[PDB]
Design an enzyme around this catalytic site. Structure first.
Site, mmCIF file in Angstrom:
data_model
loop_
_atom_site.group_PDB
_atom_site.id
_atom_site.type_symbol
_atom_site.label_atom_id
_atom_site.label_comp_id
_atom_site.label_asym_id
_atom_site.label_seq_id
_atom_site.Cartn_x
_atom_site.Cartn_y
_atom_site.Cartn_z
ATOM 1 N N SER A 1 0.816 -1.213 0.000
ATOM 2 C CA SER A 1 0.000 0.000 0.000
ATOM 3 C C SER A 1 0.857 1.274 0.000
ATOM 4 C CB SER A 1 -0.980 -0.030 1.182
ATOM 5 O OG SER A 1 -1.940 1.036 1.048
ATOM 6 N N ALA A 2 1.797 1.403 0.947
ATOM 7 C CA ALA A 2 2.699 2.567 0.965
ATOM 8 C C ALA A 2 4.003 2.342 0.203
ATOM 9 C CB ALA A 2 3.031 2.982 2.412
ATOM 10 N N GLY A 3 4.342 1.094 -0.096
ATOM 11 C CA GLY A 3 5.603 0.768 -0.763
ATOM 12 C C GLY A 3 6.853 0.854 0.106
ATOM 13 N N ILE A 4 6.744 0.597 1.409
ATOM 14 C CA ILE A 4 7.917 0.630 2.308
ATOM 15 C C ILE A 4 7.988 -0.553 3.268
ATOM 16 C CG2 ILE A 4 8.170 3.138 2.129
ATOM 17 C CD1 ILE A 4 6.869 3.449 4.874
ATOM 18 N N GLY A 5 6.851 -1.123 3.678
ATOM 19 C CA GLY A 5 6.862 -2.171 4.691
ATOM 20 C C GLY A 5 7.059 -3.582 4.159
ATOM 21 N N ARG A 6 5.979 -4.234 3.706
ATOM 22 C CA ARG A 6 6.123 -5.517 2.999
ATOM 23 C C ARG A 6 7.101 -5.397 1.828
ATOM 24 N NH1 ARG A 6 -0.405 -6.776 2.754
ATOM 25 N NH2 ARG A 6 -0.759 -6.242 4.965
ATOM 26 N N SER A 7 7.035 -4.284 1.070
ATOM 27 C CA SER A 7 7.936 -4.102 -0.079
ATOM 28 C C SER A 7 9.395 -4.106 0.365
ATOM 29 C CB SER A 7 7.623 -2.789 -0.808
ATOM 30 O OG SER A 7 6.359 -2.796 -1.500
ATOM 31 N N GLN B 1 8.606 -1.310 8.498
ATOM 32 C CA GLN B 1 7.739 -0.366 9.225
ATOM 33 C C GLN B 1 7.559 -0.686 10.702
ATOM 34 O OE1 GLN B 1 4.389 -0.604 6.245
ATOM 35 N NE2 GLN B 1 4.148 1.550 6.786
#
Ligand SMILES: NC(=O)CN1C[C@H](O)c2ccccc2S1(=O)=O
Length: 283
Positions: free
Chosen positions: A216-222, A262
């Site tokens: 969704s934000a492109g920082i956590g799972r990504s 995150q």
């Protein structure tokens, strides 16, 4: 310290939150002035997640070249990734413009369109072969070619056509469908199996542009996906695999996009994935 025993030492001492806060304190801070211009407000999903100016992807367009996307270039590992937010209703055409212009083969999606009862990204690809999508603002056509639904992920073959030139390309869509609404997976086994399927497709290899990866934000799972991939590649390349320092790799990646990983739970999960993955690689 080595990884697996540093891991047990943090578990027994219950200090994951302190380790993670140290990373947050040491992380780079670079300007993101273009992201904050008023004309770009409806191109950002979250006001506190922005690409740095020095590493942002530019659209090849003279009106407005902005997209919330960053190039993560890992020099020793010889891998690059584009990390981006889940597309918004008014950025789906920009998203596919970027895929085309950067010569990417694969798109890696780590979220569901709806999670926790709210929309986490637009429905940006077609769900039926006979119902293609046309993006008029960027002059692209997108068609579903085939779909293979498995228990933890789905792989789709897509055709992207540049309507200006009539050129076509095959894009692979790798959709991890089972990350839980809250927390992280209990075992890294299905996430690693998914990573290996992306690798086996060619989508991460130097004969193509960088893979596009989003949540969704492109920082956590990504961030978890590219951190695990790069650490495993370094363990294969080096004479001494126990010299790979996952915290140092994460701080290197945070030079190129803010906020990667995150939560302290995502940090622990990344350690678990690299540890288990290094056993399967071997030998
Ligand atoms: N008819 C249109 O306006 C074309 N669009 C392409 C696509 O249908 C799509 C998908 C998800 C959200 C928005 C759009 S759209 O409106 O940009």
């Amino acid at each position: 310290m080595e990884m697996e025993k540093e891991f047990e030492q943090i578990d027994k001492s219950g200090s994951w939150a302190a380790i993670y806060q140290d990373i947050r304190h040491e992380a780079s801070d670079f300007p993101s002035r273009v992201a904050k211009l008023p004309k770009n407000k409806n191109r950002n999903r979250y006001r506190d997640v922005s690409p740095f100016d020095h590493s942002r992807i530019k659209l090849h367009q003279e009106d407005n070249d902005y997209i919330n996307a960053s190039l993560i270039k890992m020099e020793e590992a010889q891998r690059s990734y584009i990390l981006t937010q889940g597309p918004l209703p008014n950025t789906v055409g920009h998203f596919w413009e970027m895929v085309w212009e950067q010569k990417s083969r694969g798109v890696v999606m780590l979220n569901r369109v709806m999670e926790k009862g709210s929309l986490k990204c637009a429905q940006y690809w077609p769900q039926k072969e006979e119902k293609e999508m046309i993006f008029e603002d960027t002059n692209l056509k997108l068609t579903l070619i085939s779909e293979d639904i498995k228990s933890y992920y789905t792989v789709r073959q897509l055709e992207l056509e540049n309507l200006t030139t009539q050129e076509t390309r095959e894009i692979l869509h790798f959709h991890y469908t089972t990350w839980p609404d809250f927390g992280v997976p209990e075992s890294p086994a299905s996430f690693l199996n998914f990573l290996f399927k992306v690798r086996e497709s060619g989508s991460l290899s130097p004969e193509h542009g960088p893979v596009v990866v989003h949540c969704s934000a492109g920082i956590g799972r990504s961030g978890t996906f590219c951190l695990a991939d790069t650490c495993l590649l370094l363990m294969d390349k080096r004479k001494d695999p126990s010299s790979v320092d996952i915290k140092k790799v994460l701080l290197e990646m945070r030079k190129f996009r803010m906020g990667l990983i995150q939560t302290a739970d995502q940090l622990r999960f990344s350690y678990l994935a690299v540890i288990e993955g290094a056993k399967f690689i071997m030998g």
